[PDB]
Amino acid sequence: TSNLMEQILSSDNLNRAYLQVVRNKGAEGVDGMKYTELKEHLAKNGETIKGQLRTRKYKPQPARRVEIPKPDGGVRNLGVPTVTDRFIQQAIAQVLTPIYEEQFHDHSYGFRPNRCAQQAILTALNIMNDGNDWIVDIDLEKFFDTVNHDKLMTLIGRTIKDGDVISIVRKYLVSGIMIDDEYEDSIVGTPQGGNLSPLLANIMLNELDKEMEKRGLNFVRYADDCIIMVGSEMSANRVMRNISRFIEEKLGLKVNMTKSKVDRPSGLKYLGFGFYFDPRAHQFKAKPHA
Amino acid sequence: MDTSNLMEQILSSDNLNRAYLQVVRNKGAEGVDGMKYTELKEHLAKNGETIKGQLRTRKYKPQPARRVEIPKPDGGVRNLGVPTVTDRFIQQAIAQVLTPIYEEQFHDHSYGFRPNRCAQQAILTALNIMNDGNDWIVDIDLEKFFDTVNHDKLMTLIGRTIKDGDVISIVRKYLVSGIMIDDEYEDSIVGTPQGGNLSPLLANIMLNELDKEMEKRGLNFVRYADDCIIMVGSEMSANRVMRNISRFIEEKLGLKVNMTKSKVDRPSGLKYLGFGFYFDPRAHQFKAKPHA
Ligand SMILES: [K+]
Numbered sequence: 001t002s003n004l005m006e007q008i009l010s011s012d013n014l015n016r017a018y019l020q021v022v023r024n025k026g027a028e029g030v031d032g033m034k035y036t037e038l039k040e041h042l043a044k045n046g047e048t049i050k051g052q053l054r055t056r057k058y059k060p061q062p063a064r065r066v067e068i069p070k071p072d073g074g075v076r077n078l079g080v081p082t083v084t085d086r087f088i089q090q091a092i093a094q095v096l097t098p099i100y101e102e103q104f105h106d107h108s109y110g111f112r113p114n115r116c117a118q119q120a121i122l123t124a125l126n127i128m129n130d131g132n133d134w135i136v137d138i139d140l141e142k143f144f145d146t147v148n149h150d151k152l153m154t155l156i157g158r159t160i161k162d163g164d165v166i167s168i169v170r171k172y173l174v175s176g177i178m179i180d181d182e183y184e185d186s187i188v189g190t191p192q193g194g195n196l197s198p199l200l201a202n203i204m205l206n207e208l209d210k211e212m213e214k215r216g217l218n219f220v221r222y223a224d225d226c227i228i229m230v231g232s233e234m235s236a237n238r239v240m241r242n243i244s245r246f247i248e249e250k251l252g253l254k255v256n257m258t259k260s261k262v263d264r265p266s267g268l269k270y271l272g273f274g275f276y277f278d279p280r281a282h283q284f285k286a287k288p289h290a
Numbered sequence: 291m292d293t294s295n296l297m298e299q300i301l302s303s304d305n306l307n308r309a310y311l312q313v314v315r316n317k318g319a320e321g322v323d324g325m326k327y328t329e330l331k332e333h334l335a336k337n338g339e340t341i342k343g344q345l346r347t348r349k350y351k352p353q354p355a356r357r358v359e360i361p362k363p364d365g366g367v368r369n370l371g372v373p374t375v376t377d378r379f380i381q382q383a384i385a386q387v388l389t390p391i392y393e394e395q396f397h398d399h400s401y402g403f404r405p406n407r408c409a410q411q412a413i414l415t416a417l418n419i420m421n422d423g424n425d426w427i428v429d430i431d432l433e434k435f436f437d438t439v440n441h442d443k444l445m446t447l448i449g450r451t452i453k454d455g456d457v458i459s460i461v462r463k464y465l466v467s468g469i470m471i472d473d474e475y476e477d478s479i480v481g482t483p484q485g486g487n488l489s490p491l492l493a494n495i496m497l498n499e500l501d502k503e504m505e506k507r508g509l510n511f512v513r514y515a516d517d518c519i520i521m522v523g524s525e526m527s528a529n530r531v532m533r534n535i536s537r538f539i540e541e542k543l544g545l546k547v548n549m550t551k552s553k554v555d556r557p558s559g560l561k562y563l564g565f566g567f568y569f570d571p572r573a574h575q576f577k578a579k580p581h582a
């Protein structure tokens with residue numbers, strides 16, 4: 001992974017990145033450029049953009065902060081990169097994703113190819129129905145509002161040795177990329193925050209998956225939303241204290257001690273799903289909660 | 291592969307053990323014999339050797355499926371056929387050797403009751419096809435697969451791949467026992483189906499013929515069990531696809547199309563796998579969410 005930049009900037013990879021970003025649709029960035037204007041924009045400035053990326057002279061535009069009304073009356077915050085930056089981010093992620101997919105845990109389902117929130121629900125249900133119905137529900141503060149940039153780029157540097165890639169990735173951190181949490185409202189759609197930041201979140205949170213796997217804990221995780229499932233409150237209280245302490249001391253993330261809870265499946269809301277026990281089928285099941 | 295001696299793999303100690311563990315893990319309602327899933331191990335300890343002897347000699351008689359009416363989240367009832375836990379155990383043992391065979395034949399846009407696949411994946415694939423411009427929905431509605439499928443036609447199709455006569459025999463008998471598709475997924479419910487783990491595979495085998503025909507015609511589609519939607523770019527193209535595919539489904543597959551509920555529609559009027567659809571003008575894309 002010494003010279004990944006030319007792979008990212010290859011004719012095939014950029015052509016695939018353009019087509020994918022056009023298919024993604026999504027709202028506009030601060031420049032107001034819609035997805036239909038990207039082809040003409042790249043036909044005129046594409047080579048200039050490639051040259052700036054090669055020399056670390058490309059200036060990413062700041063993400064546009066938008067407020068999207070939620071179906072429960074509330075509002076959610078979203079940062080929308082320009083369609084040019086979403087194009088570049090997709091080009092970077094097309095190269096970084098195959099590298100990091102072999103590292104990732106099978107119970108991580110957020111923003112990964114061929115994975116979705118419904119799989120996380122069914123996997124959690126199978127674990128609950130095995131007798132692990134004491135839920136350690138650790139609530140984390142927003143990942144990109146709390147993650148340390150230098151700590152995140154250092155961890156990425158353990159796998160990615162191309163300095164030019166490290167540079168452009170860091171510049172996108174400061175641009176304000178974040179995690180589109182539309183999935184929490186049970187809405188199925190294409191995320192609008194670009195295709196780089198969720199991978200960056202999975203890289204850091206993969207450290208939590210590895211720690212939980214070493215401790216033999218059963219879990220599922222979707223982006224920064226994880227639940228751990230154990231067989232008793234005794235083990236649930238111990239896991240709650242050990243994992244939260246690991247998240248803050250080793251990962252540098254922030255645990256919301258007010259929203260975090262030890263619970264049973266009946267009172268659990270996860271990824272927009274509610275859980276209930278079916279006495280006819282003799283099993284816990286899930287469905288979208290109101 | 292060589293499918294002439296599959297019954298030996300079905301009745302092997304490891305396959306039956308994995309089948310027993312999976313069925314106990316699935317739990318589910320009881321069959322006509324009233325035997326609970328916690329009573330299977332004792333039952334197999336006593337009669338397991340006899341059962342496999344009967345299965346080896348085509349002398350095992352499956353019990354009929356227990357017909358149950360399940361109330362739905364809001365409104366009417368739901369018909370469900372529950373095999374006995376013993377028959378669920380044998381069906382799982384059969385499916386464990388047949389599923390890897392047919393997984394090599396199945397279309398990538400078939401998502402019902404398949405390993406590492408779920409309804410949300412069908413929704414997202416459909417959304418991507420709609421957002422590419424194919425937002426005219428051919429919403430063909432099929433009568434219940436196992437209420438209309440011809441048993442001879444289905445077994446003849448299975449025999450094209452499976453050459454083991456003992457497997458063909460026990461699978462046909464399970465068709466007669468009344469296995470069917472647990473359509474709990476239509477209510478957006480995520481959970482373990484109760485209709486056994488053999489009938490969904492058998493329905494996918496027959497409907498795989500529909501997938502190959504649609505792929506041959508260059509049609510964009512997603513399918514979940516017997517619930518399929520086809521997406522085209524115009525209404526005139528939607529009417530011709532509706533007439534051609536419905537005729538193919540009935541004349542070439544022997545299944546029955548409900549002409550009343552089938553319709554050519556737009557995404558906003560589509561209810562599919564418990565999801566409704568709508569266009570987001572700020573994101574410039576169709577999206578989906580659980581309908582009321
Ligand atoms: K959580």
Ligand SMILES: [K+]
Nearest residue numbers: 429430517518
């Ligand atoms: K349909």
